[PDB]
Design a protein around this nucleic acid. Structure first.
Ligand code: MG
Ligand code: MG
Ligand code: MG
Ligand code: MG
Ligand code: MG
Ligand code: MG
Ligand code: MG
Ligand code: MG
Ligand code: MG
Ligand code: MG
Ligand code: MG
Ligand code: MG
Ligand code: MG
Ligand code: MG
Ligand code: MG
Ligand code: MG
Ligand code: MG
Ligand code: MG
Ligand code: MG
Ligand code: MG
Ligand code: MG
Ligand code: MG
Ligand code: MG
Ligand code: MG
Ligand code: MG
Ligand code: MG
Lengths: 157, 199, 131, 135, 81, 88
RNA sequence: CGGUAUCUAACCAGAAAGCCACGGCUAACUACGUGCCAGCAGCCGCGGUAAUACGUAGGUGGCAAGCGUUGUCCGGAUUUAUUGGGCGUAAAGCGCGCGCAGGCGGUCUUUUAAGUCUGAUGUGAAAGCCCCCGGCUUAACCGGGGAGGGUCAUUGGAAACUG
């Protein structure tokens, strides 16, 4: 489909060999479409553009779905992967998207228009992206809850 | 006006043809300065919001203090913040004087309004920031009706918007209703403005 | 339990969900029965039954899962613990998950869900959040 | 901590420390006691001038001046710019701002405000160092 | 139809004086920040006309004009021992 | 003595008065007892609003209007009916 | 106050733009001069003869009758964590026990109304923040009405929970 990539970070890692050092570039890339599908990927190569290529190819296997009632997440949720945490809150209409570095990319490539968020834990980009993905995975719509609990949509609320 | 200088440079730097018909970018559509043809640089995230903000205050030509003040007082009305911010920027007397066709650029309309040639609902007003409401009538003071520049300002009229009304026999116009972002502007994301000012 | 039995009830339900158990039994009480009835009538469990014994009685609950798991009840927490009791005014009753979840409040007409406590315009001690 | 442990003994927050201790003291001669008042600048007379050597790895000859302030506290300050005119028994005005290199210098002499003149032959960044607009 | 005076209930704690009794009154108060009910007892002075009360009793007192340097409360009745 | 009097506010060269009641001693803009009405002299028919029955009962108790307040009360008809119920 | 506000005629683009920054955070790059010297610096840190970091110049970016520096206060700081942190190895379980005060306390029935919830009355002055109208050629500003703010006093109700 129509995918928009966005490099989040590029890092230059190194390993020590008997003759000195060896350097490799690792790229983190978040891809997705503005309709509600988004994923992330990590690639590593001895050259940056090939690192982005590997990252986008890896990312193309980890789509998720973001329930986005009225261009807004249904409710607040905390993602707690690894050592990092992200807190997401629904926001008023036309308020924009306010977020840190990579969580902004994740929430903007998914098509969510209005949301608030705060990085309550660490600031490593990989862990922030993973925590945001977990928090999104903890999201459920009113229709689904009504179906689960028997009560219809209106009697639910 | 308040900022006096070349006008093609600002449009070239921002990347749109603000206040024009593309006349600022047919030849040399690249940024000014010694550089500009030499190289192009990737934009950071801060630069994106900065550009989308300078794209709007340079369009209507008002300084930063007024810009943030009108942003804050627009934030009080019911509805969407960016929309209401960009609608009551179209209610400045300069905007209506330009839209009717009594000037060729917003600078010309501002300079016309300063010198007192335009009377709002019968009373002469000498300031360019008077927010006009719906149902008020605008004239040309009846003492400077037959001037050259204002007469040729109708020779290149860009056709009145749908939310105004104007006639040339009485040289009189009025604001009909309020615009709704489906009539004004097409190259500006106001959500970027709200992000920049809500950091 | 030693200090607070309502927290024990909530944590027993939570522990049963984590391993996908099917039912659980526990000691009975006049408030635990009514909490279980609220949970059933709201739609968070499957059934509740009462087994009689010598001293106090026992209550068993049959939990509810979707077609492929998908825990119907995904989280419990206690708000007013014995070390600190919290009370809510009629205009301060919390809304859990924008109304997706429920809050139990012990008002002057029994224990009520968050929704129905805003119909009589009454408040009181909040016991638990369930969502 | 349990809520009871906080009721019995609350949380005491940290306490910060000032970084320009001379500028927030004054002297009253009538009762001879150092009062507390926060001032953005402060004047004093310089008792010596000279140069120092910065810490490794930087290497230069940094021009300081040791001054005695109106409240009696004598400190060391740094003279910015290319060249100065300070001598003995010269009255100067000083303000906060530390140079990282010099271990002892903690304040910073403002230029062009008093017996000390500006910096000659400045063309840009001129408000600092106190130079008038040429031509 | 007449304005009234404040009335308190408490426990007698000392009686060694003449015609007076010290009364302790106990009350909750929630803390300023953590919102927890904490006990607090204030101890008063009362005017016992016939040395009726005894240590440990439960009594009711009311307010009155200053009858001494530190007494402004009057015994009303003894609730119980 | 207690009297009803004007109290100045507004802006420089744009005055606006509030008919209040106060002791003679207390400052011109200081503490009052209660507010009776308003008075704007920058219009052709001067703009006045008076609570009437409140100041009517509050002038029976021995509060004497100032000269200007007397003029305003006379124009508003208050003093004639005060006189009437004093002898009626 | 004061011939102050305001109004009407005629004349000239003529008298009227500076301050800081351009290695990264942070929006904006080239040339010459100097050679661990002169100097810069909020942190990381530049300068050792080809310096986008020092000095100047051309250009650019922010602001604008102002622009910077210093001093103090709050935020970012979840870095005193009630909301909102922890204690195997990163800072952090007293060497262990008996225990006064204190804190907390299994199941059910009846009563009470201290805590809890609710109605009414009185009060929380004026100015200030907020909401709605109005007047100054708009604004600042000035008026008019209202709301909000209490572990508040009196009096009447409910009894699930704690006592
Ligand atoms: Mg500099
Ligand atoms: Mg008059
Ligand atoms: Mg004159
Ligand atoms: Mg001319
Ligand atoms: Mg940049
Ligand atoms: Mg060179
Ligand atoms: Mg620099
Ligand atoms: Mg330089
Ligand atoms: Mg400029
Ligand atoms: Mg200004
Ligand atoms: Mg300043
Ligand atoms: Mg400062
Ligand atoms: Mg803090
Ligand atoms: Mg422990
Ligand atoms: Mg160790
Ligand atoms: Mg240790
Ligand atoms: Mg221990
Ligand atoms: Mg041990
Ligand atoms: Mg019990
Ligand atoms: Mg007890
Ligand atoms: Mg008030
Ligand atoms: Mg108006
Ligand atoms: Mg006002
Ligand atoms: Mg008001
Ligand atoms: Mg009972
Ligand atoms: Mg009862």
């Amino acid at each position: 489909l129509d995918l928009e990539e966005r490099v989040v970070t590029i890092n230059r890692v190194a390993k020590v060999v008997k003759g000195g050092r060896r350097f490799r570039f690792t790229a983190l890339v978040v891809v997705g479409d503005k309709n509600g599908h988004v994923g992330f990927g990590t690639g590593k190569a001895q050259e940056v553009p090939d690192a982005i290529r590997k990252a986008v190819e890896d990312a193309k296997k980890n789509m998720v779905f973001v329930p986005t009632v009225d261009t807004t997440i249904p409710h607040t949720v905390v993602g707690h992967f690894g050592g990092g945490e992200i807190l997401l809150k629904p926001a008023s209409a036309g308020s924009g998207v306010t977020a840190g570095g990579p969580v902004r990319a994740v929430l903007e490539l998914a098509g969510v228009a209005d949301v608030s968020s705060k990085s309550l834990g660490s600031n490593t980009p990989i862990n922030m992206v993973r925590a945001t993905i977990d928090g999104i995975k903890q999201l459920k719509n009113a229709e689904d809850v009504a179906k689960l609990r028997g009560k219809t949509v209106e009697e639910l609320l | 006006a308040r900022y006096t200088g070349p006008s093609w440079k600002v449009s070239r730097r921002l990347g749109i043809s603000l206040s024009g018909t593309g006349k600022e970018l047919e030849r040399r559509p690249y940024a000014p300065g010694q550089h500009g043809p030499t190289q192009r640089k990737k934009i950071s995230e801060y630069g994106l919001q900065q550009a989308e903000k300078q794209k709007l205050r340079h369009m209507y030509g008002l300084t930063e203090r007024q810009f943030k003040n009108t942003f804050n007082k627009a934030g009080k009305l019911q509805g969407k913040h960016g929309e209401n911010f960009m609608i009551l920027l179209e209610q400045r007397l300069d905007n209506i004087v330009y839209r009717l066709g009594l000037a060729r650029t917003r600078r010309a309309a501002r300079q016309l309004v300063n010198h007192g040639h335009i009377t709002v609902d019968g009373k002469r007003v000498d300031i360019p920031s008077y927010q006009v409401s719906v149902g008020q009538v605008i004239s040309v003071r009846e003492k400077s009706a037959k001037n050259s520049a204002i007469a040729e300002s109708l020779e290149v009229s860009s056709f009145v918007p749908e939310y105004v009304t104007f006639d040339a026999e009485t040289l009189t116009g009025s604001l009909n209703r309020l615009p709704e972002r489906s009539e004004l502007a097409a190259e500006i994301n106001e959500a970027f403005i709200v992000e920049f000012y809500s950091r | 339990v030693m200090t607070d039995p309502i927290a024990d009830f909530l944590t027993r339900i939570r522990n049963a969900n984590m391993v996908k158990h099917d039912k659980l039994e526990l000691p009975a009480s006049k408030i635990k029965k009514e909490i279980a009835e609220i949970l059933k009538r709201e739609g968070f469990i499957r059934d509740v039954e009462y087994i009689e014994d010598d001293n106090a009685g026992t209550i068993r609950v049959f939990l509810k899962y979707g077609a492929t798991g998908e825990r119907v009840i995904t989280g419990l927490k206690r708000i007013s613990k014995p070390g600190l009791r919290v009370y809510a005014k009629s205009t301060e009753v919390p809304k859990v998950l924008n109304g997706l979840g429920i809050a139990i409040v012990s008002t002057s007409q029994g224990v009520l869900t968050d929704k129905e406590a805003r119909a009589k315009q009454v408040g009181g001690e909040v016991l638990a959040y369930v969502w | 901590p349990t809520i009871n442990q906080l009721v019995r003994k609350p949380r005491q927050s940290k306490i910060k420390k000032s970084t320009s201790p001379a500028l927030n003291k004054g002297l009253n001669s009538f009762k001879r006691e150092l009062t507390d008042v926060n001032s953005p600048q402060k004047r004093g007379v310089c008792t010596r001038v000279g140069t120092m050597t910065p810490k490794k790895p930087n290497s230069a000859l940094r021009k300081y001046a040791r001054v005695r302030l109106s409240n009696g506290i004598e400190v060391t300050a740094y003279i910015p710019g290319i060249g100065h005119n300070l001598q003995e028994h010269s009255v100067v005005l000083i303000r906060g701002g530390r140079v990282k290199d010099l271990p002892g210098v903690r304040y910073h002499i403002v230029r062009g405000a008093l017996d000390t003149a500006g910096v000659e032959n400045r063309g840009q960044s001129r408000s600092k160092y106190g130079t008038k607009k040429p031509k | 139809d007449r304005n009234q005076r404040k009335v308190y209930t408490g426990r007698v704690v000392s009686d060694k004086m003449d015609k007076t009794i010290t009364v302790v009154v106990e009350t909750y108060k929630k803390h300023g920040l953590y919102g927890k009910r904490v006990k607090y007892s204030k101890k008063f002075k009362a005017h016992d006309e016939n040395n009726i009360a005894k240590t440990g009793d439960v009594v009711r007192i009311s307010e009155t004009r200053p009858l001494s340097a530190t007494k402004h409360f009057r015994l009303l009745e003894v609730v119980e021992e | 003595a207690v009297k009803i009097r004007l109290k100045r506010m507004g802006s420089k060269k744009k005055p606006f008065y509030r008919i209040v009641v106060a002791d003679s001693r207390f400052p011109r803009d200081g503490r009052s007892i209660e507010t009776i009405g308003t008075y704007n002299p920058l219009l052709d028919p001067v703009e006045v609003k008076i609570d009437e029955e409140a100041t009517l009962k509050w002038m029976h108790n021995g509060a004497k209007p100032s000269d200007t307040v007397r003029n305003l009360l006379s124009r508003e008809g208050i003093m004639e009916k005060f006189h009437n119920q004093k002898l009626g």
